[PDB]
């Protein structure tokens, strides 16, 4: 199935995924397409940050759902 | 209705203002300290300060006494001040930014379809309580706040967690320094200021907050500076 | 060697450190003394924001240098 990821610039990343895919898998796919390291990525759906070990199915993310990508800042 | 609390981080606040369609003539910067040397690092001019401070029991007895004194004894508040009440747990981030922009409207530029421009045009004649109910219902700002709460160097807490930290805005309107806090029933007039002295005068109010709570370190100030 | 960390309140925290200590180590020492979690800490020296993986030596922070601490707290 296809899902959409919108960035702060308003750009759309389209991913091919399965309901059984983990949030880690999705972050790997975003790294493949955009070159953003997974550890910097925060995926948001229904106002909630998604956890690495859970599946798209766990969050009722379906075909053509839109997620939001935010970047965790490094601080120091 | 319950929102997520925003990180006191200029990168987060500047991104939020961009999403609300403000042109970046003004950008938030950190304030490192309150002495002249560290304040000299803030770019000038400054048209607002946002202060994050702790809501402790000591703070609350002072807030109670201040409210009772001003209700019974009076104060001057110019008709030009834009004030809104807080009726939403953890929206003080949004209400602080609206206070900062709404009270500098003449120095601000907005893009095509700015959601903040639309909010300000529609709420211009509303009472402070009506402005608060309008924000409860204003989806474009609620979803922008939501995104912004997930930004910053820290993770957003659970929506159920109690927040004991609070944002207020300090601005110059019509010759005076106003503290705008949606938790209070009115602006607080802190006396005379000017465009040229707002940073110094605002920081003098921030100092009084810190001296009333001498054992607390949980403070942050950001200054809205010309870009 | 001793270094000083000034907060926005103007409070001075004294730390015992070595030149080889990382910015992460200094933040851990501030957590030990003040109970501020490292993730909320942002350290500045000579107007420049410091990175976690670098040493005091990297920044020429010496005996009795003063750093500035900004807190990335969340407010309602
Ligand atoms: Br950062
Ligand atoms: Br100025
Ligand atoms: Br130590
Ligand atoms: Cl103005
Ligand atoms: K007005
Ligand atoms: K003003």
Walk me through the structure.
The complex is a heterotrimer of chains A (76), B (227) and C (76). Chain A has 76 residues and is α+β, with helices and mostly antiparallel strands. Chain A contains one helix and five strands, in the order E-E-H-E-E-E. Chain A starts with a strand and ends in a 5-residue tail after the last strand. Chain B has one domain (1-227): Peptidase C12, ubiquitin carboxyl-terminal hydrolase (Ubiquitin C-terminal Hydrolase UCH-l3, 3-Layer(aba) Sandwich). With 227 residues, chain B is of the alpha+beta class. Helix content of chain B is 38%, strand content 19%. Chain C is built from one helix and six strands. In chain C, a hairpin with a 5-residue loop joins strand 1 and strand 2 (12-16). In chain C, 36% of the residues are buried. Chains A and B meet through strand 5 of A and helix 1 of B. Strand 1 (6-7) of chain B pairs antiparallel with strand 6 (74-75) of chain C. The complex binds bromide ion (BR) (3 copies), chloride ion and potassium ion (2 copies). Chloride ion binds next to loops of chain B. The PDB classes it as hydrolase.
SSE class of chain B: alpha+beta
What would you say the CATH architecture of chain C is?
A: Roll
CATH superfamily of chain C: Phosphatidylinositol 3-kinase Catalytic Subunit, Chain A, domain 1
What is the chains' assembly state? heterotrimer
Main β sheet profile of chain C: 5 strands, mixed
The name of the CATH superfamily of chain B reads Peptidase C12, ubiquitin carboxyl-terminal hydrolase
End-to-end Cα distance of chain C: 40 Å
């Amino acid at each position: 199935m296809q899902i959409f990821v919108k960035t702060l610039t308003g750009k759309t990343i389209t991913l091919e995924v399965e309901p059984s895919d983990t949030i880690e898998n999705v972050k790997a796919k975003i790294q493949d397409k955009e070159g953003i390291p997974p550890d910097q990525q925060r995926l948001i759906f229904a106002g909630k940050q998604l956890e690495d070990g859970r599946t798209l199915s766990d969050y009722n993310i379906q075909k053509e759902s839109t997620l939001h990508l935010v970047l965790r800042l490094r601080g120091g | 209705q319950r929102w997520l609390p925003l990180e006191a981080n200029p990168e987060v606040t500047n991104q939020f203002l961009k999403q609300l369609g403000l042109h970046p003539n003004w950008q938030f910067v950190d304030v490192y300290g309150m002495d002249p040397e560290l304040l000299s690092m803030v770019p000038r001019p400054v048209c607002a300060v946002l202060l994050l401070f702790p809501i402790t029991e000591k703070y609350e007895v002072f807030r109670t006494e201040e409210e009772e004194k001003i209700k019974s004894q009076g104060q001057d508040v110019t008709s030009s001040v834009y004030f809104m009440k807080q009726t939403i747990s953890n929206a003080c981030g949004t209400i602080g930014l609206i206070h900062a922009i709404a009270n500098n409207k003449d120095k601000m530029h907005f893009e095509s379809g700015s959601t903040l421009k639309k909010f300000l045009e529609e709420s211009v004649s509303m009472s402070p309580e009506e402005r608060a109910r309008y924000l409860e219902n204003y989806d474009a700002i609620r979803v922008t706040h939501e995104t912004s709460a997930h930004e910053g160097q820290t993770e957003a807490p659970s929506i159920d967690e109690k927040v004991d930290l609070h944002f207020i805005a300090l601005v110059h309107v019509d010759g005076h320094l106003y503290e705008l806090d949606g938790r209070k029933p009115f602006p607080i007039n802190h006396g005379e200021t000017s465009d040229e002295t707002l940073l110094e005068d605002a920081i003098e109010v921030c100092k009084k907050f810190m001296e009333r709570d001498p054992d607390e370190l949980r403070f942050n100030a950001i200054a809205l500076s010309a870009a």
